[PDB]
Design a protein around this nucleic acid. Sequence first.
DNA 1: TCATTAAGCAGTCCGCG
DNA 2: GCGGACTGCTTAT
Length: 901
Amino acid sequence: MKEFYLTVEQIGDSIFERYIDSNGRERTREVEYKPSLFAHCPESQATKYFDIYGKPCTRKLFANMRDASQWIKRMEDIGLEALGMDDFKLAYLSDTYNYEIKYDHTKIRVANFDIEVTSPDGFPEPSQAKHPIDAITHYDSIDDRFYVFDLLNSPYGNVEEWSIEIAAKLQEQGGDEVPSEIIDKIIYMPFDNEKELLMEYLNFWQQKTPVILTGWNVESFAIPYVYNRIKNIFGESTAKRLSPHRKTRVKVIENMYGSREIITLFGISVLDYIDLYKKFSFTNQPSYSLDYISEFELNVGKLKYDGPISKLRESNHQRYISYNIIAVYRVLQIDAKRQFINLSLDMGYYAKIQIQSVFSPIKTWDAIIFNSLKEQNKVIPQGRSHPVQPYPGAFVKEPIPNRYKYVMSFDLTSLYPSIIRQVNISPETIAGTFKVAPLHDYINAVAERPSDVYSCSPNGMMYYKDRDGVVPTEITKVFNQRKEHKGYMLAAQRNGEIIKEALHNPNLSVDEPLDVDYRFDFSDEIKEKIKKLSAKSLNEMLFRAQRTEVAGMTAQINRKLLINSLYGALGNVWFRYYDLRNATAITTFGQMALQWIERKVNEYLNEVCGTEGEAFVLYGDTDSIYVSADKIIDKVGESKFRDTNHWVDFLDKFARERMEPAIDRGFREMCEYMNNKQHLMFMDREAIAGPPLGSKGIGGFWTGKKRYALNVWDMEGTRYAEPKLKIMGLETQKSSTPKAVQKALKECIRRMLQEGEESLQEYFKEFEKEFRQLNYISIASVSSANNIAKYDVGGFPGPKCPFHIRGILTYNRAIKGNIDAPQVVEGEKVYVLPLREGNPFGDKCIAWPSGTEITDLIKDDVLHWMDYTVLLEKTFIKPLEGFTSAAKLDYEKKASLFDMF
DNA sequence: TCATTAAGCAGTCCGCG
DNA sequence: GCGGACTGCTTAT
Ligand SMILES: Nc1ncnc2c1ncn2[C@H]1C[C@H](O)[C@@H](COP(=O)(O)OP(=O)(O)OP(=O)(O)O)O1
Ligand SMILES: [Ca+2]
Ligand SMILES: [Ca+2]
Ligand SMILES: [Ca+2]
Ligand SMILES: [Ca+2]
Ligand SMILES: [Ca+2]
Ligand SMILES: [Ca+2]
Ligand SMILES: [Ca+2]
């Protein structure tokens, strides 16, 4: 096989590399890598190295990396550009792996671990590590085994061995329901003292040294705790054995309002799964406890135990250990679904970076671009210092608040990366500037043509047309990869809808799910077989289809994220190719493009309907437009349609055969106007929305910018078995909104869009009557909790104290003295509830850590003093009044003349 | 929450005769 | 009460 790196580090004048050799063996080497950097040199000197602007460079070969680093400094002292890759390990990887890396994940040791620490006096601080580690579960991807290190003897209690037999039993038998598919994969090791446990763990670690190290909060808790505990017990040199190169560093993580300390293990790639989840999942969750995320992702039930976690080991050690094993497994189950490890390896090896650098699009793109240029013997510029400056973004149209019955939306494919490619926007393709007219003048095609030579953006920037810049070239490659995975995702989605239809008529038989690739549209034969399957098989197939769709979603949306972040990096001062001219050239071009096509679509439709000045485009945001289709439907007349699917077909056909060609013509004209390199403005029909045929549903509504709801029948070629609510920005979509209120508001919207005013009034009336029964957690608001200290004045709200912070302070007084009650953690999330006048807490609200039950001694008081009236008005009625006043509907029946009888 | 602009709403503080 | 100046937080893109 072709070799690939596993990890790479720089330690002084040495590169330390762990790699897979041509035989599949993991190896490690120390290499005295001699880096090269570059300086400009006279034109009259023969060279093969040129900077990105075509200026000649001389290569400087250094005896060692420290010499290269010192040279960079002296070049700053002289005031001359020191060119080339200054991150020497990236240069090492580029020299060592000078081909497209083909990796084999089955050779990469992925470790997933979790530790338990019994602590009576509150949260066990990883920097102190004053309490024994009493359980470690460490899953190894190469062995496919869960290694369980169990401490039987502690200052906090001596316990019996964990029993695998009881762990396997159902909870109804007194067991722990450890999933049977992992029972045989458990290797259990009990220890009668902590020192031998940790010593054996380190020997184990040495034998099976993680390459990828993951788990849940392992970077902030598990790793620093293990490291510091071993340090406290044995000394530093022993703790450093967690690094295969025996080097570690306490790294300070600086945010906006303070800092925390992580341990950097040289030669390990730490990908904390919480951090992967936050970056790649595209969710915002009310809580990030493993129980909460597990329930959300896998629909598995919460890990149930009596009493505090600090008493679980002594009271029920059996369950203590089993829950530790399950926690590690749940992360593996999340990854099996979401596939973020796979994604990280894909991206990491593509860019030729340390795998942990996938969190940084700036680092990722710096390495892609460097490797690309190096192939042509071109030399990257030195990174420079820049002040942070604001710059303009996307255009968002102000919509008229209203109901909108029939809506068809159109959308530009991967807009900003398409703009980069169309205009040819790159650091080295800048050709000059032109005198800019007001944007309006370009939108309306009255401004002078910017250039007859160069490719232009309406911000005044001109670009070369003779050859692609490195940014357009490299963005296209990832764009094309994305397209492939998006294809699989959509096929899987369309396949899901076929199964859902079939499920309406399941066959009474015993059979099996079909062995099929869900990434490809089902053949006619597969469709025929599906129509004969039982519910059991169909549901299994549905689960598999939806799993395939999720996998495709991960692959496509995060490739989209990486390419959009290249645009974003152009506006980040730390990016090597930071340039606000280029960042603004993209956004301004986008502003023109959207408003240009709004004008074109209006003109086209006014033409077909024989009108003038009618506004068909009701809304747009960045890259997409929403067109009122009422007049199109009215032109054939509703009574002419057989069913809903009939007008959806008609609108689908009108969009594809009439509107898309007109939209294309508009954009091709715009391309010529800006003299762009290549026409890449591809705007296709996105959504078809409207009420069910012959219903009183309103179909859709806008309340404002970034706030709307549509009843969608077809989305990007997926024809849904059941209409799907597309709701953007409204309270149903916000993590801050109580769970039960999201649900209620969503049902209110469903009724508005599908059934109409009367149905909405029925539901509202019932919700208002019953809501006081809802579980307190489900009706709690959620908020992140920053700067608690800032607003804490002697335990009371200081000036300008936010409502949620006030709640936390109330909570802190209620639990005062109690080290055992959960503390609210700065920067994490809290549930928030209002409190009625004259309550014992002495304030108008209380807040406690999210994803948790509030502590028992104050729970009964919270439940007794909860202000349901304020809760209802703030979270439910206020937003609903916003939806209904926009839609010109009443959520409560107005009095009529019929009330006389 | 270490990690690539537009614009909405909640809430504080305070003016608005 | 609302709405502007402002902080805080959270979405859409
Ligand atoms: N997370 C982000 N970071 C930077 N720019 C973004 C981000 N999300 C969106 N944008 C910008 C760049 C996008 O091209 C543009 C419109 O985004 P969006 O509507 O999500 O889809 P898209 O047009 O980029 O891709 P698609 O092909 O899926 O439509 O807005
Ligand atoms: Ca735990
Ligand atoms: Ca788009
Ligand atoms: Ca699209
Ligand atoms: Ca059937
Ligand atoms: Ca869009
Ligand atoms: Ca098209
Ligand atoms: Ca009480």
